[PDB]
Amino acid sequence: MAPDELASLEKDFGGRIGVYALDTGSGDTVGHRADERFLMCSTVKTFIVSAILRRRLSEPGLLDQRIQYTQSDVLEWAPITSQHVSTGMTVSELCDATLRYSDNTGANLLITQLGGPKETEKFVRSLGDNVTRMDRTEVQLNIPDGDLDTSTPQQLVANLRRLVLDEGLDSRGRDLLTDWLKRNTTGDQSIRAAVPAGWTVADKTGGGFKGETNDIAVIWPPGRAPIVMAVLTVPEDPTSTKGKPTIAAATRIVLRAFGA
């Protein structure tokens, strides 16, 4: 029933929907186009921040380091970092802004601190991800260009499970990451719109210039093991605003499949 409903949803949407979801209690999965490539867009911020958290283990005091930047660094969507050009922000504060507000300048600053876009790639490679690639910075990473800056739904779930639930990070880095994701402010109309009230969700959204809309999440229902999922969407109509409600509709399909 669920993969049929996902195929029906995709037909209604007009475009391509990639879904993968794992119930860590049952071990059951739901998938549609789960092995196909999609732009990660800003979902990649999850991994940039995770790479910074791992890097701190080799660079004592990294999170407290204050980074100075300039007006040239400030992009159109830089809700936090645009307010602190004179005074700088710490690496921790840049991780906060990058995840909770999808701050694009924050992301770029962190990529520079790591040593460039391939450093995040080296990080996911260390987790055993041989699928994802990172190539560009904000905002060019949102523009389709070959397979640059792509992953698949299933790979994104594997990585999110490893980082939020398992030992991809040390326990304090996992808590830092997970709290920032739980506290995301940009996901209310995506996966979260479909989840019952009171259940905790950790998520990271992404979106492109042609209506591409993504969300990846961990969901904690009461009294059972968490669910990890990814929904990636590419409308045929490049001006479509249907991505977010389509994500919520796919989530409702998934939750019903998982008895939630």
Would you list the domain boundaries of the chain? 1-260
* Residue among 42, 102, 190, 240 flagged as catalytic: 42
Burial (CB count <10 Å: 0-12, 13-18, 19+), residue 57: exposed
**Which residue, among 104, 113, 95, 93, has the nearest Cα to 169 in the 3D structure?**
95
| Cβ proximity of 178 and 16 under 8 Å | no
What DSSP line would sit under 110-169, residue for residue? HHHHHTSHHHHHHHHHHTT--S------TTGGGS--TTTTEE-HHHHHHHHIIIIISSSS
137: which residues sit within 8 A by CB, 6+ positions away? 107, 108, 111, 117
- Nearest CA among 205, 175, 179, 201 for reference residue 190: 205
Closest CA to 81 of 103, 110, 108: 103
How many CA atoms are closer than 13 Å to the CA of 249, on its beta-carbon side?
A: 18
Q: Is 30 in contact with 18 (CB distance < 8 Å)? A: no
For residues 34 and 152, is the Cβ–Cβ distance under 8 A?
Answer: yes
Give CA separation, 133 vs 115, 168, 195, in Å: 16, 18, 30
Neighbours of 147 (CB within 10 A): 12
Annotation says 42 is catalytic: yes
The runs of H, that is alpha helices, within the chain are 2-13, 45-55, 91-101, 104-114, 117-126, 153-160, 171-182, 191-194, 243-257
Which of 93, 119, 138, 212 is the catalytic position? 138
Tokens describing residue 99 = 């995840």
Q: Which fold has domain 1-260?
A: Beta-lactamase (3.40.710)
Q: Which of these, 188, 43, 52, lies nearest to 120 by C-alpha position?
A: 52
This structure was determined by X-ray
- What is the C-alpha to C-alpha distance for residues 5 and 250, in angstroms, rounded to an integer? 8
